[PDB]
Write a protein that binds this ligand. Structure first.
Ligand SMILES: CC(C)=CCN1c2cc(C)c(C)cc2N(C[C@H](O)[C@H](O)[C@H](O)COP(=O)(O)O)c2[nH]c(=O)[nH]c(=O)c21
Ligand SMILES: CC(C)=CCN1c2cc(C)c(C)cc2N(C[C@H](O)[C@H](O)[C@H](O)COP(=O)(O)O)c2[nH]c(=O)[nH]c(=O)c21
Ligand SMILES: CC(C)=CCN1c2cc(C)c(C)cc2N(C[C@H](O)[C@H](O)[C@H](O)COP(=O)(O)O)c2[nH]c(=O)[nH]c(=O)c21
Ligand SMILES: CC(C)=CCN1c2cc(C)c(C)cc2N(C[C@H](O)[C@H](O)[C@H](O)COP(=O)(O)O)c2[nH]c(=O)[nH]c(=O)c21
Ligand SMILES: CC(C)=CCN1c2cc(C)c(C)cc2N(C[C@H](O)[C@H](O)[C@H](O)COP(=O)(O)O)c2[nH]c(=O)[nH]c(=O)c21
Ligand SMILES: CC(C)=CCN1c2cc(C)c(C)cc2N(C[C@H](O)[C@H](O)[C@H](O)COP(=O)(O)O)c2[nH]c(=O)[nH]c(=O)c21
Ligand SMILES: CC(C)=CCN1c2cc(C)c(C)cc2N(C[C@H](O)[C@H](O)[C@H](O)COP(=O)(O)O)c2[nH]c(=O)[nH]c(=O)c21
Ligand SMILES: CC(C)=CCN1c2cc(C)c(C)cc2N(C[C@H](O)[C@H](O)[C@H](O)COP(=O)(O)O)c2[nH]c(=O)[nH]c(=O)c21
Ligand code: NA
Ligand code: NA
Ligand code: NA
Ligand code: NA
Ligand code: NA
Ligand code: NA
Ligand code: NA
Ligand code: NA
Lengths: 208, 208, 208, 208, 208, 208, 208, 208
């Protein structure tokens, strides 16, 4: 298996719920175990931007996402925002890679400062202290200096700052193609195979 | 007239030629004078990502863009990359707002360090020294610390760092809707009217 | 009209509820639209320091403030602390100036770090990213280095740090004169006319 | 009396509830007044790590701790997390020394940034601004750079960063001996007598 | 005696002469020796803001203040701005606490940079080098980054930055109540008893 | 084999000789090759805190530790403090992970500044330059800003700062349980299997 | 008793052995307990600059200094450079103030970086972590930026940097008067009475 | 001639007038042209610490110093504190080395910040901009962080910070020997011959 067996996927309240849902689908299809976390604000983004009717409480949410993605029983493990007995809360847990997608400016802030006010924030704090992968996918424009400083500090500490800034160099034809671009780069960063975005120049041998 | 009469629009070699072409169209439709600059790499992005067959040399390029956008004679003024007798090269010029869209990581770097190696870079240098508007629209993912530090320095100095990171909170249905999101925010930042992206919450009076 | 048409006025839990209430009154009298936000702690400051019996919930609060200030229907628009569909939550909103008066040390902190944990904090974050006015009115003594660093960062980024530190150079005769001093400086900073605090030296022509 | 008459003892959600309970016992035995604060997460640490069945609400908690420690009526004063009318919330209060034991990484963060989101955080903010003692007892491993920067900033500002890192140089024979080591150093830092940890080398007169 | 026997009280040219006069009165009433210093600009503030007719020269000023405050002969010791043979000019002097109230932005600057251009500035320089108390009471709004950086540097070095920012949480009824608030906090910072501002929450035992 | 084949284990003169001895035992049991280094001060810690009678000179020490741990001939390789012909002295050596356990404040300092005054310090210097694992286990309380800055610099450069700060969340019953906690985290950081500390939450599937 | 009961007096290898010997004499005369430490280089300074024939080994040195100063048995306690069982090596010791007089540039460096290579350096490290007094008396000219940065860092952390830079404002008539000036300032900094250097301006009441 | 032909010698108001007078004497004896500057505070130091009755005004002062030092007519050139037509005020002047001896903390500050408030300060500013020698001889103890930062900045910019901290390694027998030590180091720094302080170790050939 290339890449991590387990991914902590946290959705926070930036625009771009579709990115997180598509990533979840792809992780499931790649037979990975996903520890899924979602903020209250992200639930309201999802309701605003999609037709997904996500149940609010963890057990119902787990059953719903398992069906939605065609996952195996136990493959998607949902934890609530104060569930400190979940694996991501401790560095003594089995190792996971972590992705926050989308990453609100507020969660970016919390991670940069070490606020640890809920399980998402603590999970990121743990990832950093244990030197386990941490990928943040912010969606904001403009970025202020506040945002930039927070991203810089985290990138300097080894987090991957991967803005939801899709490329156009494969002539996207739909919204889904642009969503898939970002998801592909997340997967590439994690070392998980993907066939949505070709390997640039792989079959280019010499310059024209 | 709300907003600037003149905009220096520079296209550099990041993905997202469509953003710059759409912005040009909208500026023309808003009856603004555009001083248009394009890098060699941006010409190759445009050829790769679009069906626009842009002529290489400034005079031909000017005639072509005037036709393409339905602009008035003289409305789009194209300057070459070493044309120091063009207005954007001096702070003694009539004031323009400047947008670099898309903004490559290399142009971001040049602007941050003050390299002034061509007219785009010098134009940005001038904007900063004269405290005239400067908006950079980078398209990259991940952002490294190199990128982030350069963006931070410029944001601290009053440039607007506006990543090509479209929002989804108006349920986009096409690639064009996502392009129009970013273009709308550029226009909003410049103070130019636009009717592509509603004013959020304008008719919300009290909380539920 | 000189100055902004719309002001987001946030009250947070520092001492000096009278400053925020007086500012609200003056904004109403100047025919401005006010997007009014108040924290839970500020509600307890107001109950402790004033005889104003402010209702807790936004709709009731809106009706009460409209009566209290003699505002027009629709002139004061109250939003709750999680109301992300309110204008101040997005930079795609119509532009407002923002004042946090009083500004607790905790809200100062949140704004400086980018915490965005409620609508007040997100609104400030938006103001900074969009380069729209942001005035913070802290009331604390002593200021620690924590406070000072947070104020410095924000002032460097263009926020106005306007401490509730009234002057005595017009021989104030009451508490209200000292309240009006601070409110006058807030109005001056926003570019809104006021006749509470004279223009110093306006009719001085030469030195003695 | 050597040392402070009053100690604000805050327990937050790091591992090591035993340290805070032992410190409380020792402070009581030294006839000090304790203003006791505990976070929601710390209540769940205490339930997980000890057999102490602490009641949730302040009045019940006060009665329970008074009995548990053999304190005098009024000696332990419990305040809830939003009780701004408690002494620690204002610098106009009678002076107390403050100890956060254990200190979670999240509370460390809040104190470093000035978040003031509850009474513990505000109490620490007050201690710093008034230059009153503040001792933080973090329990984490590894420490990331996030943690380290926060500790460094606070130590530079005069807080004592006292990690729950017991020494072995008095040949500890039980868990309690290691708990007592840390508690002894806290007491020493506060200037409160203790006879758990000898004064190193006190009766050494010259080198061998 | 709690607190310092001797206080160097310097008045500089910020608004708020009443704060310095009230502090002087309270120090006298607490039987402290005061080494009183006043800048030329502060003399013009006092004449503008009060009805106190302070004589210009030190001997006359000393006699006048002694009468005004009901001080003992020798209790108030006035030194001129170039009087290097006064105690505050040398760290070999008997120890004093020092308060600059009000503290102009210019004196704040001088202290931060070490300018030592007159006895007030040198006295502060001495306080810092000898690690003797130094309290600055600035009165300005807005604070620029210039002001903030200067205050930050000094707070980091152990000075107390105590802005003339009175609280309202004891329902002040007059200007004098607001003056007394600030003076009370100065006295509290110095460790001198005062009965103008109650000890917050002293008789609160448990949360509601 | 998961984790490194070879570990350079350096013991320096902080309290907590038991941690280093237990780690050595566990590494031996996991069939790893250990390049063992010990400072003069650490030898005096070991004699003070344990009943282990460690011989002073490398050959005798090697024979003694081999017996003590039940190691294979050649499995523990002891090098003296000036033995520059030992593998850890050069980056051209076969790769090892390095652990300094316990890590004195003086060795922390030396590593942070690059002092390279003995083989332990040079070995760490090499680890950093070659980007090979380096784990420091300090035992000190309080940590001063000196200590914190040194730890911060090293953590920023990729070293793991793992304080000897055991957790209590598995209800330790002896000193050995607390020693084993820290050793388990060291092993986890190195990627070496251990069964002393469970994987937190591994069999938790959804929130309560 | 004003000032500390115990002083750790370390002599290191800067010029000015007379300062350290005079300080020792004065501390003895003030009935203080002195924990005396001396570096190898300082022994060679003392032999070069004075006629004091100090024995090399701690026991002999203790007997010699006791006689030389007319101290009580037990009043001067000499510890060798590796004597970790001496009080100054641990923060669990009874509190002492510490003076390094003279302070070589190398010891200044060691203290600033936290090197802890001998008992003097460790003792200083302990003083800083425990927030106990630490006074360094460097003697060097010029000071390089290396020296200055080290002094700055330590002064920022609360150490007193007291250069052997005697004043002339009491018209010194001998070398001993200049030695006594510096010793007097050390004593003043520690809060120990001295009658060598008058209190400047004590009997000055008003300006001329 | 080794060393500069012309020296700007400024005396400012630190203790140690004897150092500046002795330096002046030695410069005269070495046949150098001296541009002599003295502050008002330095005149009061000189009157306090010496029996030199220096006239206040430049012409009288010039005649007096010429006699006092046995200088040639024209050799000592005195300029007043506002004499901008003197050579040291412009970098277009013939080059001089500059020494400020003694250097008050206030003049140190002015030089570090660039205040240029009188001819001494402007002269130093000029020296720095022209990269001409600048030696500052401060006399203060303790040095605060204010002082240290100012000295550090200037040393980093190439000024020589030469504290009036005499050495004892040539067994000084009088105050004059200690004065001559500092003066000798100033002369050495300037490259002017002196025979007061031997060249250390010049006739040492090998180690003992
Ligand atoms: C159109 C509005 C109001 C903003 C665009 N977008 C967004 C869309 C929708 C539809 C909602 C509701 C909210 C957002 N926000 C704001 C955000 O959720 C909040 O600041 C919030 O406190 C974040 O908390 P968490 O970190 O999730 O715990 C948010 N935050 C952000 O960083 N980027 C975004 O794109 C947006
Ligand atoms: C798929 C590749 C090779 C990259 C995606 N994209 C891009 C697409 C295409 C199709 C081409 C050709 C080039 C890019 N680049 C690279 C970029 O043009 C260069 O670094 C270049 O030096 C920039 O110079 P200028 O600043 O314009 O003068 C570039 N640079 C950047 O910052 N962002 C991008 O999205 C991309
Ligand atoms: C006399 C006390 C307890 C303090 C004076 N004053 C104040 C008065 C009253 C009467 C109450 C109740 C609270 C305060 N506080 C504390 C403050 O509200 C809190 O830190 C709180 O978390 C702020 O949260 P928000 O930012 O509003 O969400 C507060 N905070 C602050 O920055 N400045 C103040 O003046 C005071
Ligand atoms: C075994 C786990 C999940 C961690 C070890 N330990 C701990 C034990 C237990 C059993 C629980 C439940 C929680 C922790 N935590 C996490 C911590 O409580 C939270 O981040 C929390 O948000 C802190 O909030 P507060 O600052 O108290 O308001 C925590 N935080 C920390 O800084 N150090 C710790 O030792 C641990
Ligand atoms: C209404 C005006 C002109 C300002 C309000 N106020 C003030 C009132 C009055 C009535 C006078 C005359 C002067 C002030 N100033 C300016 C200040 O005195 C000067 O900058 C001055 O150089 C200070 O020198 P010092 O530090 O005292 O030596 C001053 N400076 C300051 O920091 N805060 C103030 O409140 C004011
Ligand atoms: C109870 C005393 C004197 C201190 C507790 N402990 C300790 C215990 C014992 C019993 C001895 C003997 C020494 C220590 N030290 C001091 C330390 O060994 C020294 O600073 C030394 O120079 C370190 O050199 P190395 O880096 O090993 O080369 C030391 N240093 C440290 O960082 N942490 C400790 O816990 C302690
Ligand atoms: C005339 C010489 C060679 C220098 C003047 N003086 C001095 C005098 C004598 C006569 C000796 C022998 C040595 C010095 N030194 C150098 C110093 O001792 C060393 O750098 C040494 O390593 C210091 O180690 P420690 O910190 O004591 O462990 C030294 N160091 C210093 O900082 N200031 C001094 O004044 C002098
Ligand atoms: C015993 C006193 C009051 C101090 C010791 N000494 C000194 C002695 C005498 C006897 C006088 C009168 C003054 C000083 N001072 C203070 C100093 O002159 C002033 O700060 C002054 O503003 C300096 O201005 P300039 O830079 O010369 O323009 C001063 N300043 C300084 O940096 N170092 C000193 O040694 C002393
Ligand atoms: Na928290
Ligand atoms: Na160039
Ligand atoms: Na948040
Ligand atoms: Na808050
Ligand atoms: Na001056
Ligand atoms: Na070395
Ligand atoms: Na060492
Ligand atoms: Na000037």
């Amino acid at each position: 298996m290339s890449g991590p067996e387990r991914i902590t996927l946290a959705m926070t309240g930036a625009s771009g719920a579709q990115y997180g849902l598509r990533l979840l689908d792809c992780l499931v299809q790649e037979e990975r175990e996903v520890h899924f976390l979602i903020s209250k604000a992200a639930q309201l983004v999802m309701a605003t931007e999609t037709d997904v009717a996500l149940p609010a409480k963890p057990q119902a949410m787990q059953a719903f996402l398992t069906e939605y993605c065609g996952a195996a029983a136990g493959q998607i493990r949902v934890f609530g925002q104060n569930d400190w007995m979940a694996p991501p809360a401790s560095g003594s847990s089995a190792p996971n890679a972590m992705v926050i997608c989308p990453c609100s400016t507020g969660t970016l802030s919390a991670v940069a400062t070490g606020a640890c006010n809920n399980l998402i924030e603590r999970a990121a704090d743990v990832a950093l202290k244990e030197r386990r992968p941490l990928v943040l996918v912010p969606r904001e424009a403009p970025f202020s200096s506040i945002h930039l400083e927070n991203m810089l500090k985290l990138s300097n500490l080894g987090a991957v700052i991967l803005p939801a800034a899709p490329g156009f160099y494969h002539q996207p034809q739909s919204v889904e193609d642009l969503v898939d671009f970002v998801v592909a780069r997340i997967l590439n960063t994690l070392g998980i195979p993907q066939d949505m975005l070709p390997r640039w120049g792989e079959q280019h041998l010499v310059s024209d």
